């Protein structure tokens, strides 16, 4: 699935 990078 699509992603938007690492988060906290």
């Amino acid at each position, epitope marked *: *699935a*699509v992603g*938007i*990078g*690492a988060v*906290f």
Partner: antibody
Amino acid sequence: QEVLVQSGAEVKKPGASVKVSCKAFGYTFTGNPMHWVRQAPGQGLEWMGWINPHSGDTTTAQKFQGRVYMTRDKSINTAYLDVTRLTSDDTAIYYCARDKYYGNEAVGMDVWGQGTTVTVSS
Amino acid sequence: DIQLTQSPSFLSASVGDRVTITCRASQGISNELAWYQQKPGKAPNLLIYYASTLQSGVPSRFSASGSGTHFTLTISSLQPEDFATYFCQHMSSYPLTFGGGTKVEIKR
């Protein structure tokens, strides 16, 4: 309680801009990407983009690139949607919605704001 | 873009009926699909993710199946609180899109 609280209704003229806010309560704001989805009266749902609240990185739908800007303010747990160059076709209810984001990929929109009505008219 | 086609667009049903709603994707999307319920004046509510996993708090009379292109949401025994509109949504590539919705209303 995990809730998203959006700003109030807006009425705008064609060519103007609107900035909708979405404030997160009850969980760590920077832990989940935030989607923006709109719904014109009587119609279905249209995805506009999403933002990573940690990095501030955005992926904006191609339909809206160049005139819609997603930003965030970590200090007040708030995501913003700036929709510029409005026309009547932007009349809709605008929602923010958090993604579960398991494995750092989109999974599903599990918490939604109450919506912000935007009317664009001369 | 990927188009999700829902069927039917409108359904009239009675309390206690089994309701079956389909979503067809124009391209394979694996299990990267969610289902939502929406009532007038309210935001959608997540029912299903990973095409078949029930979201926490959702009544177990909701279930769903599918992987690939053809997905099915089933309400085993329809209750008054279930009359609403239902949407599928993929997250396989950009842009994310939703199906057109299925409005479930009361038969009389």
